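Give me the 3D structure for FP1.
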Amino acid sequence: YAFACPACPKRFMRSDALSKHIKTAFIVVALG
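Predicted structure for FP1 (32 residues):
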């Protein structure tokens, strides 16, 4: 399927290790 199989691959974590804080500067929509 395509709605849980992935979720958090080893490729996304890359664009995720700089899009949960650098995309802002706080704790509300940064981390998650």
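DSSP finds one helix and no strands in the chain. Let me know if you want a second pass.
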